[PDB]
């Protein structure tokens, strides 16, 4: 206890004289009101490593990449035709380990042809396939590191005798389908283990009878089988896999050159419909799309460089990583920016960053370059901002007039 009656001295007639002197000093100091003049006083891109090991990446151009859809951050990179030696394999599907922090290819797989695509067998952590250039979608046990295909592909008309640019899985343990899509004007929904006969091999042909050569197609989020095929020159195709809707449904363009990169995304904070698929095209552009709108949001014309890929993981789905032929990993946010890149990085020299894929349900970007080089990024700043409706709100403003 301090005192008995604390308000008596505050009401006294003599103690207030002391307070009068103190308040006189208060009025003496409050009359200054002078501030200090300044006089010119003044007062992220978490780039990870790069899987560059020429033991199996010697002058081999990286084909499409594939994040670890089954493994924890242990991606795979398909490789293009390299003629460093004639009888030696053209493309070598290599897998690495971001979780183990190394540079040498974890699992090396070299078939006879050039793997234009490579992917994981869903709910099968012991298997990785590669859709080659000659058409032999060839299987391999991933952890066995067998440099010989464990299961080749019969080069048939129903199957692919064409370069499978994108082989991928769609659903879980019951709906896993090794769909290999090539310039055969077809998809071949093979099985993960058996690859000697395709289960659902359908054609990709519009009203014309010409076999539509695909170019960097993609699959929708959640396995709704509405796979969007990038034709020989743009032509975003909507397609299905089962029922009468299976195959080519409708096309739409916002570009002319062949599509380079396209993906989907999950929850944007449980706000958007999650299928805002933004394509990119060799006519130097990046255009946002939706399956409901035939021609939505603006085409980010990524000029001065052959565009290669775009990705936008659900950790802040307003984060796409667009690139060019001169090496410009420009990843940003439409909820924050308009058309300019937030985190833009001119990669070392002029590498052709073929695939720039963020870590789905996380953030680290796998980068397949001009040579077998897997440069990987991260930001450390572009956090999954809640209420990411602004990505759709600002988008609707650009879709009015």
């Amino acid at each position: 206890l301090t005192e008995e009656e604390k308000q008596q001295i505050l009401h006294s007639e003599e103690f207030l004289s002391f307070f009068d002197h103190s308040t006189r000093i208060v009025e003496r100091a409050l009359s200054e009101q002078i501030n200090i003049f300044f006089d010119y006083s003044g007062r992220k891109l978490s780039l990870n490593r790069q899987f560059f090991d020429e033991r199996w990446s010697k002058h081999r151009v990286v084909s499409c990449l594939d994040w670890s859809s089954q493994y924890p951050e242990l991606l795979v990179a398909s490789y293009n035709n390299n003629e460093d030696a004639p009888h030696e394999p053209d493309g070598v599907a290599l897998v690495w380990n971001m979780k183990y922090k190394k540079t040498t290819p974890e699992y090396v797989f070299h078939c006879q042809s050039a793997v234009m695509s490579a992917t994981f067998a869903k709910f099968h952590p012991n298997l990785v396939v590669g859709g080659t250039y000659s058409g032999q979608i060839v299987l391999w046990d991933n952890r066995s590191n067998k440099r010989t295909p464990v299961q080749r592909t019969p080069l048939s008309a129903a199957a692919h005798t064409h370069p499978v640019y994108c082989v991928n899985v769609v659903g879980t343990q019951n709906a896993h389908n090794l769909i290999s899509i090539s310039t055969d004007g077809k998809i071949c929904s093979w099985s993960l283990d058996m690859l000697s006969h395709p289960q659902d091999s359908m054609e990709l042909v519009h009203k014309q009878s010409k076999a539509v050569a695909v170019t960097s197609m993609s699959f929708p989020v959640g396995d709704v089988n509405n796979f969007v095929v990038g034709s020989e020159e743009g032509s975003v195709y909507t397609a299905c896999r089962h029922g009468s809707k299976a195959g080519i449904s409708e096309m739409f363009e916002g570009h002319q050159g062949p599509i380079t990169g396209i993906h989907c995304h999950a929850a944007v904070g449980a706000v958007d419909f999650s299928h805002l698929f933004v394509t990119s095209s060799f006519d130097w552009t990046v255009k946002l799309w939706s399956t409901k709108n035939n021609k939505p949001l603006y085409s980010f014309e990524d000029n001065a460089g052959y565009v290669y890929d775009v990705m936008w993981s659900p950790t802040h789905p307003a984060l796409f990583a667009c690139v060019d032929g001169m090496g410009r990993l420009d990843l940003w946010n439409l909820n924050n920016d308009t058309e300019v890149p937030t985190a833009s990085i001119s990669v070392e020299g002029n590498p052709a960053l073929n695939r720039v894929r963020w870590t789905h349900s996380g953030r680290e970007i796998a980068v397949g370059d001009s040579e077998g080089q897997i440069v990987i990024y991260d930001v450390g700043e572009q956090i999954a901002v809640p209420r990411n409706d602004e990505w759709a709100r600002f988008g609707r403003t650009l879709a009015e007039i």
Partner: protein, 177 residues
């Protein structure tokens, strides 16, 4: 913004009072009353030049400034606004000049010389099928810059000599492409 209010008010109030739906006279007093409204127009033009120099000051490159400039090219028609913001307009045309010359350089260091040849080979597009895409690629970007040329200066795009020469050289470059 509030210039729209000034437009509507003085527009009706003077446009329908000049002759007030009466003509066939010497049409000079009628013209004098519309000159009074032209003064109202000039006041709104000053308001619009302030507003648009702000929004068009926020963006300055040949593409970014052109976006907001393209959203108001119709406001960029009359010479009291065009000749005043001609400072920025000449800068935009000079940047388009540098961009078209860079397009010339893009066809110089073309597709088979760039890594795109092999990158297109990932998608199987050899130079016989890819250099032609590079040609139409620069053609598309040239069409964009022709829109830049003819919209940074709207109906008076021919008045700007730089944009006219860019149109000539760029179309000859289209023929080369």
């Amino acid at each position: 913004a509030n210039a729209i209010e000034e437009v509507n008010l003085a527009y009706e109030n003077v446009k329908e009072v000049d002759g007030l739906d009466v003509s066939k006279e010497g049409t000079e007093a009628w013209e004098a009353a519309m000159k009074r409204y032209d003064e109202r127009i000039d006041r709104v033009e000053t308001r619009i030049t302030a507003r648009l120099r702000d929004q068009l000051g926020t963006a300055k490159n040949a593409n970014e400034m052109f976006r907001i400039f393209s959203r108001f090219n119709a406001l960029f028609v009359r010479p009291h606004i065009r000749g005043a913001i001609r400072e920025y307009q000449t800068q935009l045309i000079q940047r388009v000049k540098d961009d078209i010359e860079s397009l010339h350089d893009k066809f110089k260091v073309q597709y088979p010389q760039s890594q795109a040849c092999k990158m297109s080979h990932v998608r199987d597009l050899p130079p016989v099928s890819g250099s032609i895409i590079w040609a139409k690629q620069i053609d598309r970007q040239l069409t964009a810059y022709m829109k830049r040329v003819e919209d940074v200066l709207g109906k008076g795009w021919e008045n700007h000599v730089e944009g006219q020469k860019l149109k000539q050289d760029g179309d000859s470059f289209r023929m080369k492409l």
